Design a protein around this nucleic acid. Structure first.
Ligand SMILES: [K+]
Ligand SMILES: [K+]
Ligand SMILES: [K+]
Ligand SMILES: [K+]
Ligand SMILES: [K+]
Ligand SMILES: [K+]
Ligand SMILES: [K+]
Ligand SMILES: [Mg+2]
Ligand SMILES: [Mg+2]
Ligand SMILES: [Mg+2]
Ligand SMILES: [Mg+2]
Ligand SMILES: [Mg+2]
Ligand SMILES: [Mg+2]
Ligand SMILES: [Mg+2]
Ligand SMILES: [Mg+2]
Ligand SMILES: [Mg+2]
Ligand SMILES: [Mg+2]
Ligand SMILES: [Mg+2]
Ligand SMILES: [Mg+2]
Ligand SMILES: [Mg+2]
Ligand SMILES: [Mg+2]
Ligand SMILES: [Mg+2]
Ligand SMILES: [Mg+2]
Ligand SMILES: [Mg+2]
Ligand SMILES: [Mg+2]
Ligand SMILES: [Mg+2]
Ligand SMILES: [Mg+2]
Ligand SMILES: [Mg+2]
Ligand SMILES: [Mg+2]
Ligand SMILES: [Mg+2]
Lengths: 142, 239, 62, 46, 201, 127
RNA sequence: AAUUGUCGGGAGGGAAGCGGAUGGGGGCCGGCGAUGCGCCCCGGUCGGUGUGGAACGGCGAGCCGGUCCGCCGAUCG
RNA sequence: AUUGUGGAAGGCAGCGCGCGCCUCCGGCGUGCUUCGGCAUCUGCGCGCUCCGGACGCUGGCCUGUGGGCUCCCCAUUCGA
RNA sequence: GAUGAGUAGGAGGGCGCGGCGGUCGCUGCAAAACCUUGGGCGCGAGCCUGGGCGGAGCGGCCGUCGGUGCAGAUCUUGGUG
């Protein structure tokens, strides 16, 4: 959020319940964020699911290899129960890829997250296929 | 028909082409300026090359002319010196330490050019055992600037890979190419101070073949002091 | 060896950022970091530097 | 009011690399050609 | 059109004639007249959806302008030259050099009858070229190339006949030179006090 | 998973920095301590003595903290934390925490196979 | 932990240990080292323009969209 | 002999072949010249190269008596 | 782009110990401690992990706090050559 996103980032960038830090604060330090609306799970203002009004969520939905595509509604920032515009997709990857491009880049929602969303969709879709059948290739070549 | 482009995107897109248009014009304007400069530096280099040969033959003619008349021809005193530091930075008396800093010789085997005048010569006389110097020939000046020449741009050491580096600093003085820089140094032109200061002190290597004795003067068989035209022989082995 | 002082490095210290943790001040610093860089205005550069300064270096004006 | 939005070159020895020398001193090519031609005439003359 | 290069090179990258001379030879003056006193101006020469989007942007290597050149042939090695193999199972044997293949390797023959070395490829770095030359004018190896030595054990009869056809033309030349047959039938070796850096080959 | 790293790992030093005289005295442990003594020959860096660690030994920043397999380690304690590496499976490899039960390791290992996430110690305590 | 016995490996011409560099002998390590990818047809499986509904969205009344279900056409992926 | 750091740019620089003819190691037009020559005409298109940092080919080997090792014991040269 | 010595001394950024306010987890399908010729990471303080032993607790992260880090003191107590 109800306040500017830049202000929220100043507050939550140091400490929040979704911040995962390991190996101290030296060179070995590794930082990740695990909020559901962070495509790359990176602790950055770009990918933050807390400091941006417009965010993209792509994750498995229920069963039957369904993929949920949810985007935060701009006018519902103060209504958590109705903030997400969910869209369950259960078609081919090509159809799902077009839907993500339409709801992220074509409407100028978050064009800077188009690449991340498609990669996120690609990763989620591949994992669903493996779960149904199981691992068959080690993906170690090249 | 199709998603309506928001006003913000249109405004950014409109300005991008304007910047691109202005940016594009620079290449066309710069390209024409560069083309003219290549002809300019080509003719200057041709002119400088002719001048060097004429001076060499002019000196020979004068010496022969004096011989024919039975007199003597005193060659003009050297206008340019090349100074190389041959001693380290340990156990430095305060006076020598200050003078070497003013000469920009802060490291052993560093080298610099120096104009000849009573003020500079007297300074050099006071650091005689710590340096060796002489009169550099055209070959030595070319090799140093071409192989180990670096320009001081905004107090940074920049390799003289392109003539643009030379023009960026010395352009206002008429020096736009490395050949102009060579000509200014060799002839000690009106803008020698700026041209010479623009050159970072040369970081020479240890001499191939070594030194005789750094602790004695060149006259005694050592390596310190004025060796006149024999500095060129040392420059070959250290460049 | 090289005859320099402290290896040619600066021994001067100046504030490159505010010491405060005030989130609003940091947003102002970000705003005027951009203005100074993209405009080259001397006014913006002066404003940016004074935002770093301590309390006693920002005295009140009656 | 914002102004328009805006790596080290490996130094090569012009005394050995011809193209590098010509980039700095275009007249070097003319000097090189004349020296080669002049030597050829002297060798032939002898 | 022009039959020979206009500007021969005195050295690599430097032509014999200057820009002013080349303007006369290029004929730009003649071209200017034919086009109304102006040099003609030309014009510049005028998909499937991905099945997987990588999470990390792919990096492509920068352009390298250096192109490999064909392997050079040592001046000491000329067709018909006798070579000494320095490595491998045939180390020390003296063979006859036939030609250089496109890959840069040397095509050599024993001949197989004299020393049991068939048509084989030998790297130039592992041979020494002697001063002995045997005529190979009558030897035809135009049919042999790199593909002739490419894998895909019994040696097919086709290659055995091919060896004999090339070998036969070479035996007559070898027999002409006295003591050359025995020379090619004996391996080179170093004896006591024999200094390789002093030997003449 | 194909590691994204392509530059070779160059270790400036593979030997550890052992505390001076830790061999002589049992009570003096091997963990490094800077010798502060006035006469300490190790502190004064006499040749033929124990070496002291300094910043010069710093490894290349591009290959720092990379395991020999070509990935960086991230410690996971449950299945949920494993999912954080879904979009970094070419850069980060998971390692199950030492104190995770064998029952919960099976879930993590199974989930990692679906996500193509490398597990460094996937064979731990399953026999 | 100091310290002791035993079994096993190894070394030793008035100390031993330690830094650096290899080697010998051990011990240990399959993310210690891949086996995929692209294009073809055989079969199998699973979904497909234009009109109807369901629950919503982006831009700000109105335009501009995707998801899911059904019906036609299309006949590929 | 040592070495390939970078991974966004076919840029910069110097040339070649076409855009006019000839007998083709060369010849044919202005300006200047020390009579040898000359960045005086030398523009465009497509290419080449000592040109904004290494690419290519081949073989060996891949559960072996193989490979690797920062771990262990020991030996040796130098240091201590 | 330049540059790298450091006792006494100063300062910065970090490592580690035990609580407290929060937050995220682990554990009888085996926590802490301890053992190891297992392996790895960091210039380093240290950290992560395999195996063993053990049989009931423990850890990460943010903030905050302190009876918070030992080779020496003819140091203290206990133990042992
Ligand atoms: K024992
Ligand atoms: K080389
Ligand atoms: K192998
Ligand atoms: K030793
Ligand atoms: K806690
Ligand atoms: K351990
Ligand atoms: K604490
Ligand atoms: Mg002294
Ligand atoms: Mg230097
Ligand atoms: Mg020598
Ligand atoms: Mg001496
Ligand atoms: Mg003395
Ligand atoms: Mg130094
Ligand atoms: Mg100091
Ligand atoms: Mg280490
Ligand atoms: Mg002392
Ligand atoms: Mg354990
Ligand atoms: Mg014990
Ligand atoms: Mg590279
Ligand atoms: Mg220091
Ligand atoms: Mg603790
Ligand atoms: Mg032990
Ligand atoms: Mg801890
Ligand atoms: Mg307490
Ligand atoms: Mg205390
Ligand atoms: Mg104690
Ligand atoms: Mg003490
Ligand atoms: Mg005591
Ligand atoms: Mg006691
Ligand atoms: Mg006793």
């Amino acid at each position: 959020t109800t306040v500017p996103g830049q202000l929220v980032w100043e507050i939550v960038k140091k400490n929040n319940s979704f911040l995962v830090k390991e190996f101290g604060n030296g060179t070995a330090g590794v930082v990740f964020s695990k909020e559901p609306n962070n495509l790359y799970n990176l602790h950055s203002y770009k990918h933050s699911g807390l400091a941006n009004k417009k965010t993209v969520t792509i994750q498995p939905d229920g069963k039957d290899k369904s993929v949920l595509l949810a985007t935060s509604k701009t006018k519902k920032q103060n209504k958590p129960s109705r903030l997400l515009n969910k869209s369950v997709m259960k078609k081919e990857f090509s159809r799902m890829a077009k839907a993500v491009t339409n709801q992220v880049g074509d409407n100028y929602y978050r064009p800077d997250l188009k690449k991340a969303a498609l990669a996120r969709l690609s990763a989620v879709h591949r994992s669903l296929k493996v779960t149904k059948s199981g691992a068959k290739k080690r993906n170690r070549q090249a | 028909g199709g998603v309506v482009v928001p006003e913000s995107v249109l405004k950014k897109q409109k300005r991008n082409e304007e910047w691109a248009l202005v940016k594009k014009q620079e290449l066309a304007v710069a390209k024409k300026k560069s083309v003219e400069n290549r002809k300019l530096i080509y003719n200057r280099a041709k002119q400088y090359a002719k001048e060097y040969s004429e001076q060499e033959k002019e000196l020979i003619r004068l010496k022969r002319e004096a011989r024919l008349k039975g007199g003597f021809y005193v060659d003009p005193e050297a206008k340019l010196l090349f100074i190389i530091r041959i001693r380290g930075i340990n156990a430095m008396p305060p006076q020598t330490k200050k003078i070497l800093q003013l000469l920009r010789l802060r490291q052993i085997f560093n080298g610099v050019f120096l104009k000849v005048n009573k003020a500079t010569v007297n300074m050099l006389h006071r650091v005689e055992p710590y340096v060796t110097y002489g009169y550099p020939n055209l070959k030595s000046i070319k090799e140093l600037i071409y192989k180990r020449g670096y320009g001081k741009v905004d107090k940074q050491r920049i390799a003289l890979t392109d003539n643009a580096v030379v023009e960026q600093v010395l352009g206002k003085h008429g020096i736009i190419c490395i050949e102009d820089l060579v000509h200014e140094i060799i002839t000690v032109g009106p803008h020698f101070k700026e041209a010479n200061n623009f050159l970072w002190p040369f970081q020479l290597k240890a001499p191939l073949g070594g030194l005789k004795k750094k602790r004695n003067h060149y006259v005694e068989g050592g390596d310190a002091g004025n060796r006149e035209n024999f500095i060129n022989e040392l420059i070959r082995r250290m460049n | 060896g090289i005859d320099l002082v402290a290896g040619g490095k600066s021994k001067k210290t100046k504030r490159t950022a505010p010491k405060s943790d005030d989130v609003y001040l940091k947003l102002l610093v970000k705003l005027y970091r951009f203005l100074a860089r993209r405009t080259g205005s001397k006014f913006n550069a002066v404003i940016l530097k004074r935002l770093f300064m301590s309390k006693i270096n920002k005295p009140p004006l009656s | 009011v914002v102004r328009p939005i805006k790596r080290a070159t490996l130094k090569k020895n012009p005394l050995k690399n011809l193209n590098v020398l010509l980039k700095l001193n275009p007249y070097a090519k003319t000097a090189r050609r004349m020296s080669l031609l002049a030597e050829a005439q002297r060798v032939k003359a002898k | 059109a022009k039959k020979t290069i206009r500007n021969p090179e005195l050295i690599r990258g430097v032509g014999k004639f200057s820009r002013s001379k080349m303007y006369h030879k290029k004929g730009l003056w003649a071209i200017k007249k034919k086009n109304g006193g102006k040099l003609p101006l030309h014009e510049k020469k005028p998909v499937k959806p991905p099945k997987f989007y990588p999470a990390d942007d792919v990096k492509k290597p920068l352009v390298n302008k250096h192109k490999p050149k064909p392997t050079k042939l040592r001046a000491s090695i000329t067709p018909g030259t006798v070579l000494i193999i320095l490595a491998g199972r045939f180390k020390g044997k003296r063979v006859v050099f036939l030609k250089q293949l496109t890959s840069g390797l040397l095509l050599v023959t024993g001949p197989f009858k004299l020393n049991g070395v068939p048509l084989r490829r030998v790297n130039q770095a592992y041979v020494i070229g002697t001063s002995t030359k045997v005529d190979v004018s009558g030897v035809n190896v135009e049919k042999i190339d790199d593909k002739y030595f490419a894998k895909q054990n019994v040696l097919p009869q086709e290659k055995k006949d091919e060896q004999k056809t090339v070998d036969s033309a070479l035996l007559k030349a070898i027999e002409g030179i006295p003591e050359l047959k025995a020379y090619l039938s004996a391996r080179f070796s170093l004896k006591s006090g024999m200094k390789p850096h002093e030997l003449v080959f | 998973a194909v590691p994204l790293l392509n530059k070779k790992v160059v270790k400036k030093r593979v030997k550890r920095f052992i505390r001076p005289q830790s061999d002589r005295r049992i009570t003096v442990k091997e963990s490094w301590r800077r010798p502060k003594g006035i006469d300490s020959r190790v502190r004064r860096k006499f040749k033929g003595c124990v070496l002291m660690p300094n910043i010069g030994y710093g490894s290349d920043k591009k290959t720092r903290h990379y395991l020999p397999n070509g990935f960086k380690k991230f410690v996971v304690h449950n299945a949920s934390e494993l999912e954080i590496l879904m979009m970094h499976n070419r850069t980060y490899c998971a390692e199950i925490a030492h104190n995770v039960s064998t029952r919960k390791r099976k879930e993590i290992v199974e989930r990692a196979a679906q996500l193509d996430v490398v597990i460094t110690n996937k064979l731990a305590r399953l026999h």
